Design a binder for this molecule. Sequence first.
Ligand SMILES: NC(=O)c1ccc[n+]([C@@H]2O[C@H](COP(=O)([O-])OP(=O)(O)OC[C@H]3O[C@@H](n4cnc5c(N)ncnc54)[C@H](OP(=O)(O)O)[C@@H]3O)[C@@H](O)[C@H]2O)c1
Ligand SMILES: NC(=O)c1ccc[n+]([C@@H]2O[C@H](COP(=O)([O-])OP(=O)(O)OC[C@H]3O[C@@H](n4cnc5c(N)ncnc54)[C@H](OP(=O)(O)O)[C@@H]3O)[C@@H](O)[C@H]2O)c1
Ligand SMILES: O=C(O)CCC(=O)C(=O)O
Ligand SMILES: [Ca+2]
Ligand SMILES: [Ca+2]
Lengths: 413, 413
Amino acid sequence: SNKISATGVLVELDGDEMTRVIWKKIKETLIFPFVNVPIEYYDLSMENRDKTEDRVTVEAAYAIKKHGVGVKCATITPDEARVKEFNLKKMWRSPNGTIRTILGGTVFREPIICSNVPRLVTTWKKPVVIGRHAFGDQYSATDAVVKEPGTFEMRFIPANGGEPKVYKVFDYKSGGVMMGMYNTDDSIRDFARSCFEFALARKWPLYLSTKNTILKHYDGRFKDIFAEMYKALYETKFKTCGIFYEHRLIDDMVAHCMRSEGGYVWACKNYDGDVQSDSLAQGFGSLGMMTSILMTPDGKTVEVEAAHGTVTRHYRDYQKGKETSTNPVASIFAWTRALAHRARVDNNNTLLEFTQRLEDVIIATIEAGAMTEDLAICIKGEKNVVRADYLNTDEFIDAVSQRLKVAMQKSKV
Amino acid sequence: SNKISATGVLVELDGDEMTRVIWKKIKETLIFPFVNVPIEYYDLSMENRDKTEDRVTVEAAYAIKKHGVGVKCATITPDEARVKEFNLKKMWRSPNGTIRTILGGTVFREPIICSNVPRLVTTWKKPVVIGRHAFGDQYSATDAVVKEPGTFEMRFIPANGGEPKVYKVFDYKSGGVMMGMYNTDDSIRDFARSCFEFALARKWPLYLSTKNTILKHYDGRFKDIFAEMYKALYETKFKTCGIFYEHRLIDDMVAHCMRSEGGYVWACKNYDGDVQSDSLAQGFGSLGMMTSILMTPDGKTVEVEAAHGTVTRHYRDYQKGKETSTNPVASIFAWTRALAHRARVDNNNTLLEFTQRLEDVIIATIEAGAMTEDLAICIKGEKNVVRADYLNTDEFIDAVSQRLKVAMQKSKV
Ligand SMILES: NC(=O)c1ccc[n+]([C@@H]2O[C@H](COP(=O)([O-])OP(=O)(O)OC[C@H]3O[C@@H](n4cnc5c(N)ncnc54)[C@H](OP(=O)(O)O)[C@@H]3O)[C@@H](O)[C@H]2O)c1
Ligand SMILES: NC(=O)c1ccc[n+]([C@@H]2O[C@H](COP(=O)([O-])OP(=O)(O)OC[C@H]3O[C@@H](n4cnc5c(N)ncnc54)[C@H](OP(=O)(O)O)[C@@H]3O)[C@@H](O)[C@H]2O)c1
Ligand SMILES: O=C(O)CCC(=O)C(=O)O
Ligand SMILES: [Ca+2]
Ligand SMILES: [Ca+2]
């Protein structure tokens, strides 16, 4: 027992506005005093990204790839309002798009549950983790309105000599609408891999949802590639570990989500993931009670972040000297979930114990009535909430620092 | 004072198995003792359809078109198993789909709430009525698997012999998947007309969900057709009733559902209607507490039925001595909602009155503690259920029948 000292290192992406502020409080108060982790720092503030012609962002991604883990603070993505504000050379791409592109992989969203902060769904006791496919179906599609009266025909034209195959879709008298969409086995397969690695690392069962009763070929491909991946590479490791993989109908699975206790990973196609993730987010509680984790298809590499933005509104108050009650636990959990993968890879059970301890201590802090404004709101209603009911960001972080201390001291020699 | 009568006519489709039993019982007990109604009968028992080549189903559907109101009991659909049970004829199409094709219009599903039967979603205080488009999109699409390299290409081919449009969807390098789908302006427009009329007849606001952020042309059309129709034909009448029409992104809208108290109509595209209805089914409680109402686009013709099927496993159970406690209120509410529409068309206030009474009364009875097995388990759980806690089918129907005598009676001296 001394500062922990992991073998491998963590890649830290600093961000902007309110999250950078609390990110600093989190490091100084909750992490570095109790753990001795080697960091590789990269500053993804909007200033340094412009200054460097968005180069930090690329080198942050590659450093994540070499080290295997990265925590990442929320980051402003440029629009036209922000080019004027920050005086930007060009409208730089969203750092999340940039990093994902480079790393590849699939985002999984994990909520954080306390007993005293109720969910909107009375059955939910464990987390339901959605993993979204996120490489095109309707998101890479080609649509057009039909104004004339004509016929919609699909074609596949082999790259070799082979004969065209032509599909007669429909015949328009009055107007209408037409669409085409695609996916690739390479993307489906890599999605399945991330899901399987994710489920195995979390020791949770995995479900895939499709609508292969109606899209027999299109969704049947989804179902088949997952079944190929399971049998070949994962069934055994899953059985050993007390978990399983199952394909279900999207209809079945949204009812299962309503009905069930939770405790599973749920693989969703692009669209379903978009739609159902909003539903689940709402159901579980505040945006400050969920993290996003990108896992690569080999399962070796991981980027973790809070499932919210930089919370600009609360940054406008911080700048104007007002005290602020932004919920920090998504950010703190991003650090524990990051360090947990580090420890797991490195086989550093000591560090693992720290992440568990910290997460556990946060959950108790809230359960004893010490929480931020958003969470008081959930419990007591949008009104019945006075300043005394909640803590501000930093005195909340201090309240868990105090509770981490008690717990942190242990086995003193 | 003796009975209540109406000039207009009610079509009745009678069905089969357990629902057919219940159907008979609620007529004799709850509606005929208080109502003289013109009523044209069609028998949709699986035998009578086989016997009559499925023509009674097409006759029943056209009679509802003529008269404006039908009540339907659940019907067996043909599988390979079902041909042998009754007598083999042919693999006959489902009655619902034939009636739905004949009538046009959109089905709207309405849950029945009581204060003492909790929903899985804490926020739901009012019904959220999903109306599902039910033509096109994924359910009449053309999909296939790509195994060679080559090119996915869409062509629109004007019927006049004009210049065809060629879209260039994707060059596959490894295998993958392809899909083409359509909808028509006519169908989207008729769907829009049902939604505006249904929501107006019920005095609820109306939401459309699309993903027009991504399918700018495909989903944009749904948005544009709804908008242009609201401005032209409905906005005045909605403002006059104190309701509104609003387009929402499908992500925002499923989130809205989770946190809203309800009291609105929700227009869903085919797929979204399919998926989100099952989510709602599980959320609102028993399948015996929800009706379906098909409303044609002119707003004048309605077909109403229970949301569940024939209840086969209560029927095989049925009367081998073995009694049952099937929930009949979805079946009862099918009559009240039909008769309500009958009255509203007729300007027959005394019949409208009667529909409201029997509804209020059924709710009151269940809030009293008299309810079928299904509802008893909801209040708390399979283990704590004994027969002290609930009533059988005939007994519950009688319990409301006696409670109904006292209601109508509040005519005084
Ligand atoms: N990972 C990322 O890099 C990421 C993701 C999303 C958005 N963003 C960026 O963040 C900036 C702001 O975008 P946005 O306002 O749309 O998203 P946001 O930062 O999540 O803020 C939206 C609102 O959600 C509530 N909220 C969010 N986090 C909270 C917390 N920890 N505790 C309590 N309440 C919280 C606040 O509502 P009230 O003000 O009503 O309290 C807040 O104003 C943009 O520049 C956007 O591009 C970044
Ligand atoms: N046209 C229609 O309206 C329609 C719709 C769907 C299905 N069907 C047809 O009906 C037949 C059987 O359908 P199915 O077994 O798939 O669904 P179902 O008849 O609705 O029965 C499904 C199960 O749900 C429970 N349940 C359903 N309704 C109930 C009620 N009113 N009260 C209490 N419990 C209820 C029962 O389980 P417990 O006994 O364990 O409670 C029942 O076995 C099939 O031939 C099918 O094609 C017709
Ligand atoms: O297919 C649908 O849209 C509804 C299911 C149904 O009731 C039927 O088709 O018989
Ligand atoms: Ca979304
Ligand atoms: Ca369904």
